[PDB]
Amino acid sequence: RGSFVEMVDNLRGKSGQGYYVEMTVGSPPQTLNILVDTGSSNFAVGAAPHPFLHRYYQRQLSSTYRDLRKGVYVPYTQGKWEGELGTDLVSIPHGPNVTVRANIAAITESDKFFINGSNWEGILGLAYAEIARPDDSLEPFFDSLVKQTHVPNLFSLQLCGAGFPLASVGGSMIIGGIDHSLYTGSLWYTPIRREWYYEVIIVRVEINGQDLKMDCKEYNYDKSIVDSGTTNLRLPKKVFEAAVASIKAASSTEKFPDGFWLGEQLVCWQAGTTPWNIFPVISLYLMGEVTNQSFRITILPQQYLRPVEDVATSQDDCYKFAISQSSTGTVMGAVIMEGFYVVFDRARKRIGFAVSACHVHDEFRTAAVEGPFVTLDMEDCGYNI
Numbered sequence: 221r222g223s224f225v226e227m228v229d230n231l232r233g234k235s236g237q238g239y240y241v242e243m244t245v246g247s248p249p250q251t252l253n254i255l256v257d258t259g260s261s262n263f264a265v266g267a268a269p270h271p272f273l274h275r276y277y278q279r280q281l282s283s284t285y286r287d288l289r290k291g292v293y294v295p296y297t298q299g300k301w302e303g304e305l306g307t308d309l310v311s312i313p314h315g316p317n318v319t320v321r322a323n324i325a326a327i328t329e330s331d332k333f334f335i336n337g338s339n340w341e342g343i344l345g346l347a348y349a350e351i352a353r354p355d356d357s358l359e360p361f362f363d364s365l366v367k368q369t370h371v372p373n374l375f376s377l378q379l380c381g382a383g384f385p386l387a388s389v390g391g392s393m394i395i396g397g398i399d400h401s402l403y404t405g406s407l408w409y410t411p412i413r414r415e416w417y418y419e420v421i422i423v424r425v426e427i428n429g430q431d432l433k434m435d436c437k438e439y440n441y442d443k444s445i446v447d448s449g450t451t452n453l454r455l456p457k458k459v460f461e462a463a464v465a466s467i468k469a470a471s472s473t474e475k476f477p478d479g480f481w482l483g484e485q486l487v488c489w490q491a492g493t494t495p496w497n498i499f500p501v502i503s504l505y506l507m508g509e510v511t512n513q514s515f516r517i518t519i520l521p522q523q524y525l526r527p528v529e530d531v532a533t534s535q536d537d538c539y540k541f542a543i544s545q546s547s548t549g550t551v552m553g554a555v556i557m558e559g560f561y562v563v564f565d566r567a568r569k570r571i572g573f574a575v576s577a578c579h580v581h582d583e584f585r586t587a588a589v590e591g592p593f594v595t596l597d598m599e600d601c602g603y604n605i
């Protein structure tokens with residue numbers, strides 16, 4: 221409890237390519253790097269020689285592979301994978317000293333799934349069975365881990381982002397606990413509304429302290445989730461309109477092309493001259509643990525202006541605006557998570573936020589987690605189908 225030195229710094233990544241953990245599958249163990257995704261619930265790995273892959277799971281080499289004789293086809297908004305289901309022995313070398321029998325989708329065909337130039341070969345879906353494919357009888361990895369071992373039913377993520385001048389990203393996934401060195405201040409908890417995605421309720425939104433003043437249902441239309449497998453802070457379309465209008469207004473000392481705000485083009489500045497000061501902070505108030513109580517998390521432009529390194533077109537420091545409109549609800553992606561240590565307290569159906577000890581900031585502003593606030597009618601903020 222509180223100290224897990226063996227798991228600290230067990231995540232790696234490259235800007236724009238996500239955060240992965242080393243895992244082993246099979247007997248003898250095959251090592252793979254696996255994207256950590258709190259926005260899905262399948263453990264799925266490359267199992268054939270796709271050209272983007274550094275390596276892939278070779279089931280024929282594992283003495284402990286058990287075939288489920290069942291396939292799954294998994295389409296996403298863009299791209300898809302198809303695989304064959306089975307079980308095998310799985311470990312996380314920089315994790316708990318346990319080995320468990322987990323479901324594994326051996327990916328045999330894919331499209332726009334793997335990233336050319338990335339160093340990961342599969343995905344670890346850490347969300348709940350309700351969103352597992354093909355259905356909720358396919359037990360997620362974390363559920364198997366907790367069922368088969370004494371590992372406590374929680375994990376925490378510290379995602380440490382990037383800045384110019386371009387280093388790899390990193391962080392820590394603490395499995396079965398919390399490491400107090402990874403944050404400062406106190407943890408503040410918000411309820412997991414429903415166990416499917418890591419669904420939460422946003423009750424107020426401010427841009428540099430100025431409330432957008434929308435019906436709070438709009439903030440959670442049709443849901444709000446905490447998602448390590450998405451880069452952007454995605455906002456429902458109506459909310460995005462309001463937020464960007466407000467952010468533009470706050471930054472109006474400099475003018476940027478409309479396309480920049482829509483993620484249609486980059487903006488670049490002479491190296492070391494990024495004008496962070498002109499950009500506002502973004503605050504989300506989350507439903508608290510107690511009736512009529514909330515707390516707020518605040519991120520900086522260092523989180524939502526993402527460095528883009530691979531730009532042959534330009535010699536300068538180029539950035540993408542990583543707040544974007546959504547039709548799937550609010551997605552608190554890496555843009556949010558990189559500000560915080562985030563505790564997925566599954567045992568107590570709650571998500572904790574604390575200021576990350578590694579987050580990117582400057583001399584004038586830091587990311588923040590502050591409470592309590594008085595917020596009435598927070599249960600009305602939830603959207604119902």
Ligand SMILES: C[C@]1(c2cc(NC(=O)c3ccc(C#N)cn3)ccc2F)NC(=N)OCC1(F)F
Pocket residue numbers: 236237238239255257258259260296297333343447448449450451554
């Ligand atoms: C399953 C999936 C998914 C995510 C990824 N995710 C990434 O590539 C990725 C890239 C950068 C960062 C950062 N920072 C996080 N994730 C890749 C393939 C998927 F298939 N997970 C998800 N949370 O939303 C999109 C998705 F549903 F499509």
Ligand code: NA
Pocket residue numbers: 365366367368369370371
């Ligand atoms: Na257990």
Ligand code: NA
Pocket residue numbers: 400401402403404405
């Ligand atoms: Na601390």
